[PDB]
Structure formats: C-alpha cells, structure tokens
C-alpha cells in the first residue's frame, strides 16, 4: 500500500540524481489573486516535485492545500510562501490515525491515501516538512498583499516561469540578429573566397561562438520542459566564450547555479549575455 509508494519515490529520485544535481522544484504554481484584499491566499494549480522525489500534481492525483490565512502576518511587509509536505518516516507511521504525534504525517485517509499538502511560510519552523517556494507576497503603496512579479521559484522546467521564458526568446532573437549582422559584415568586406582583413579575424572567431551556441540553444528553447541545469550549462558556456574578448566584465561575472534562488542566476546571466552581445559588435 504505502510501503511501495515510498520505494517508488526513492527509485525516481536515485535515477534523476545520476544526471541532475537538484531534481526538484516547481512545474506549475497558479493562484487566486482575488480576495487578497481579505488577506486570504488560494492555489488553483500546483505541480511541484519535492527534494525527496515526491511529485505533487493537483490536476491528476493531489488535492489543493487549504487556504493560506494572512491575518497572522499583518505585522509583515514580505512573506515567502512554500508548499509543504510532511517528511516520510523510515521508522514511523506516515498516516493520520487520530492518535497524536509530535510531527505532521504524510498521508490522510479519504478508502485511499491523500497527501497532507499545506501552504506555509519561510518564517515558520518547517524542518518537519519538505518545502518548496511557491510565491512571495509583498505589500504595495496602499499596503495591500500582492504577488511579487520579480519572483522565480526553484525550477524543474523553464516553462514554470513565463517571464524567464520570454526573456530567453528575446535572447535568442538578439543572438540570431547579432549573428546575421556578423554574416553581413563578412559579406560586406569584398570576398573572392579569401580574407585579407585582421578586423575580420576577431569577427570570424566571434561568429564561431554564436554559430556553435545557436543550434544548441534553439533546441533547448523549442521544447522548454527540461530541467534548467541543461540550459544554464549551455548559457554559461556561451557567456564564457564571449568573455574572451571583453574587460568591462571579468570571468567571475558568470553567476554560479543556485537552484533555490533562480532570481540570482537566470536574470543576471541573461543580462550579462545581452551586454556581451551588444559590446562585441556595436
């Protein structure tokens, strides 16, 4: 019953960990912004994978967590919402049997098992739960709770962040344009299948960086439902190749991969790349 389910999560996790450092994060996290004036938050769609390997899908198997009551955080200006799932106990009972426990249990009976999913906040004691950031509520000029637009949760898929998605479609559009302008430059210089310009040397070599990356980034963006560790590796590989001919930015400019905080990795990296693209060819 529940014994096979624990083993099925461990198998999933052990395989995913052979090719991914962080096989967990958000796939979809949608909310009901209405009735935020009444200080209440509700999730509409949640597809989240936990660091232990558990996949939560409110569209298929799981039930939406109960309403998040913001009356408790009236004294706060920022609140980080996390999706919580009790830990699995290797020794204990992970089912609610009506006998009291010092810790939350993963399942409730409804007869079949249902996960005890809950919306909690980062400022609470959450070590008895597996946690995943799902939004950040910030206050406006009126002092009204509203979802922070700058928020990116840990991603399992690029598609989980529509803002980052359009920011990447924009990078590809820019890269392909700077590549095409560079195609014209080689053609602009008189050609009889021979090159006699040193100015063309830096240019021919900058075209090698762009033409190597373009097919690779195009396929990663045509199907953007894979783990962003793949995209980061190829984005960072390109940033490195372009940093060869620059001194405004050092090699330390390429952000490290912080899974838990994508806001400090994809926006700075895309910014850096767009700056490097404008700088190499003005």
């Amino acid at each position: 019953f529940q014994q096979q389910a624990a083993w099925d999560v461990h198998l999933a996790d052990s395989v995913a960990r052979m090719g991914l450092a962080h096989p967990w994060g958000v796939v979809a996290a949608e909310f009901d912004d209405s009735l935020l004036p009444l200080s209440r938050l509700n999730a509409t769609r949640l597809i989240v994978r936990f660091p232990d390997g558990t996949l939560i899908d409110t569209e298929r198997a799981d039930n939406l967590p109960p309403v998040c009551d913001l009356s408790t955080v009236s004294d706060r200006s920022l609140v980080d919402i996390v999706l919580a799932l009790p830990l699995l106990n290797a020794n204990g009972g992970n089912l609610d049997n009506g006998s009291e426990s010092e810790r939350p249990r993963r399942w409730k009976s409804e007869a079949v098992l249902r996960h005890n999913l809950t919306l909690r906040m980062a400022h609470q004691e959450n070590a008895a739960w597996l946690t995943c950031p799902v939004t950040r509520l910030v206050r406006d000029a009126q002092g009204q709770w509203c979802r922070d637009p700058r928020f990116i949760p840990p991603l399992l898929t690029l598609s989980a962040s529509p803002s980052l998605m359009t920011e990447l479609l924009e990078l590809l559009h820019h890269l392909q344009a700077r590549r095409q302008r560079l195609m014209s430059m080689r053609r602009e210089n008189n050609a009889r299948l021979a090159d006699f310009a040193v100015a063309d040397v830096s240019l021919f070599w900058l075209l090698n960086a762009l033409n190597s990356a373009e097919p690779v980034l195009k396929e990663l963006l045509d199907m953007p439902y894979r783990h962003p560790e793949l995209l980061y590796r190829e984005l960072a590989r390109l940033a490195g190749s372009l940093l060869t001919f620059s001194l405004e930015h050092n090699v330390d400019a390429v952000p490290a991969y912080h899974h838990e905080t994508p806001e400090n990795v994809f926006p700075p990296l895309l910014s850096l790349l767009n700056r490097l693209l404008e700088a190499s060819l003005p």
Partner: nanobody
Framework: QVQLVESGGGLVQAGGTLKLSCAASGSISGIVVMAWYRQAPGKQRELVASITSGGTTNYADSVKGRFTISKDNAENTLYLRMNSLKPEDTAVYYC?????????????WGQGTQVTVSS
C-alpha cells in the same frame, strides 16, 4: 543517529512531583522535535508532551496545566516536570527524538523510565 537515556523515574504519592531527564547524544543537530511518551500496562504508547528545536511546546489534554516540557540545549537534556501527579499518570515514560537526514525522518527512543503514582 541519536542516543537517548531517561532517568528520574520513581514512586510518588498522589499530588506529588517528579522531574524526568533525557540525555541526548549523537547527531543532535538533526533533531527536529523531542517528545515524552507514556505506556500504561496493557494500554498503547500515548504522547504526553512535545518541544520543537525552536522551543514550541504542546501537551496532551490529560497533562495540560500540570506538566512542563523544557530543553537545556547546553547540556543536550530534555526535561519533564510532572506536578500534581495522579494515579492515572502511572506508566513507563519514554523520551523520543524525531531526527532528519537527507529529506527522510527517523524516530529514536529511550529505554523507558517507570513512574508510579500511589493513591
């Protein structure tokens, strides 16, 4: 892994007092919540009181207002002060540790300490 040792158990007259101690050693940094459980003869092991690593206490309705769970982080000792004792409090008291390693929870127990309340 965590090791727990209870002491302080005994025989007390109704209305009396006892202080149970639970010495914790091992990977103490992985403890999420500590608790006191009790098993009366024939009856199942029931939760008495709990304390999270952040200090949040919780008590069973039967002991609420009479018992106090506390933690000495310096000495890595969990305490249970049991005042206004009743014969119904007679049982074997166990201290528990809910530990966390790599996204999995583990339960660690003490050997047990007998508490007898005479009437």
């Amino acid at each position: 892994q965590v090791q727990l040792v209870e002491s302080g158990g005994g025989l007390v007259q109704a209305g009396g007092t006892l202080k149970l101690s639970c010495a914790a050693s091992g990977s103490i940094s992985g403890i999420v919540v500590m608790a006191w459980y009790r098993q009366a003869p024939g009856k199942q092991r029931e939760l008495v009181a709990s304390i999270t690593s952040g200090g949040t206490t919780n008590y069973a309705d039967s002991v609420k207002g009479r018992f106090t769970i506390s933690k000495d982080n310096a000495e890595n000792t969990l305490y249970l002060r049991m005042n206004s004792l009743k014969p119904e409090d007679t049982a074997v008291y166990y201290c528990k540790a809910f530990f966390r390693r790599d996204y999995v929870g583990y339960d660690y127990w003490g050997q047990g300490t007998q508490v007898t309340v005479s009437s």
